[PDB]
Structure 1
C-alpha cells in the first residue's frame, strides 16, 4: 500500500496511508461525529515536531467537519476509517496560512501530520 490519496483539487491536502483501517461505511466517521485521534505534527521545512498527542500519552477528540480544527484535519480525517494510520501533507492554506501560529509554526509552513483514527462516536 502506502497508497497516496489526493484530497483537494489544489494539491494542498495529500494523505499517504501507512496502515489501512477497517472496512465498511460503518467504520467511516460521519460529519458531526466525535472522532478520537492520535497525531504527531512536524514542519516540512525543518522536520521539527511542534505538537504530539503521543508524547502526552492521551489522544485528542474533536467533532468532525465543524471547523474546530485546521481545515487539513477536517479534510484528512473525513477520508479515514477506524484504525487507519496516515501521514498527511498540508499546504499552509490548510494549516495556519501566511501568519503561522505561535512560536513553533512560522508563516507559510507546510505541515506534516501523522494521524491515527482510534475511534468515533455519535
Structure 2
C-alpha cells in the first residue's frame, strides 16, 4: 500500500511511461524528524530509470501516479523499503521512510 498526499496541483494529463529519461528532485526524510538524504543542497538532480530494478521500487510506486511539475509526500512500508536489514550505517532494521519526491521534466 502506498499513500500519496499532493502538495502541488499536477496536470495529470501525462504519465511516466517505460523508457524515457526523467529528472527528479527529492529529499529523503526518516520518521520522528530525522533527515538522512536530500538533493536540493547537493544541487544535483537525481536521474534514475523505471522498469529494470536499478533502484528500490518505492520510487516507482510513488512516481506511477505522479505527473510533470508535481510535488507530493511519499510514504513507504518496510517491506517495500530495505526491510529486515536496512543499509548498515544509516538505516536501522525494520524502519519505514518518507519522501518528498518531485518531478520536473519527462523526456
For the criterion TM > 0.5, the same-fold answer is yes
Larger RCO, structure (CA 8 Å, separation 6 or more): 2
Q: Deviations over 1:10-65 (max 9, x none)?
A: x3x211111122241xx321123222111111112x32111101121121111123
Partner of 1:83: 69
State the 4+ residue runs in structure 1 displaced beyond 6 angstroms. none
With 109-118 and 55-64 compared, the bigger mean Cα shift is at 55-64
TM score, norm. by length of structure 2: 0.90
* Equivalent in the alignment of 1:7: none
Q: Describe the superposition over 1:60-88 as per-residue Cα deviations: whole angstroms up to 9, x where unpaired.
A: 11112322221110111121100110111
Gaps of 5+ in 1: 1-10
- CA RMSD, aligned part only? 1.3
Q: If each structure's strand is expressed as a fraction of its own residues, which one has the higher value?
A: 1
Q: Does 1:55 align with 2:41?
A: yes
1:100 corresponds in structure 2 to 86
TM-score normalised by length of structure 1: 0.80
Unaligned runs of 5+ residues in structure 2 are none
SS of 1:75's equivalent? Answer: helix
Instruction: State the alpha-carbon separation in 2 of the partners of residues 117 and 99 from structure 1.
Output: 30
Contact 2:22 2:105 in 1 (8 A): yes
